[PDB]
Amino acid sequence: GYEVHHQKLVFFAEDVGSNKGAIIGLMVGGVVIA
Amino acid sequence: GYEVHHQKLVFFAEDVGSNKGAIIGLMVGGVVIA
């Protein structure tokens, strides 16, 4: 038959330090003022 | 038949330190002032 396994989807895979703006993974519509 | 298993979806996979702005994973519509 079929077999689908172990897919993987990462947006940010390491550290996110000292952010002072906007960090978005997925954004559908909308405004970002940074 | 079929078999679907062990998919994985990560947005932030490591530390998030000293944030002073906006950190969003998924955002549908809406405004972000940073």
Place this chain on the structure above:
Amino acid sequence: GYEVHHQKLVFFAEDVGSNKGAIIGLMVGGVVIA
């Protein structure tokens, strides 16, 4: 039959430091003022 496994999709694979603007992974529509 078929077998699909171990695909991988990364957007940012390393550190994101001292951001002061806009960092987006996937953006469908919408405005970004940076």
Place this chain on the structure above:
Amino acid sequence: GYEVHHQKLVFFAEDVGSNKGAIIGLMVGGVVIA
């Protein structure tokens, strides 16, 4: 300064009649057997 107004986000903008399956607007994770 800045001014952001009158954005609009619609998922289904017209009639939804005689549904016999699954109609979802936004789905994060989860299984749908239809």
Place this chain on the structure above:
Amino acid sequence: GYEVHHQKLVFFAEDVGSNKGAIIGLMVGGVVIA
């Protein structure tokens, strides 16, 4: 300055009749068996 207005994002703009499967607007992760 800046002015952002009257954006618009539609997923389904007309009728959805006699559905017998799966109709999804936005789907992040997850399985759909139709």
Place this chain on the structure above:
Amino acid sequence: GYEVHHQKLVFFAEDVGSNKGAIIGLMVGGVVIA
């Protein structure tokens, strides 16, 4: 200054009738068995 207005993003702009499979607008990760 700047002015951004009246953008528009449509996924399905007309009727969707008698569906028996999977109709998705935006899909990030995940399996679809149809």
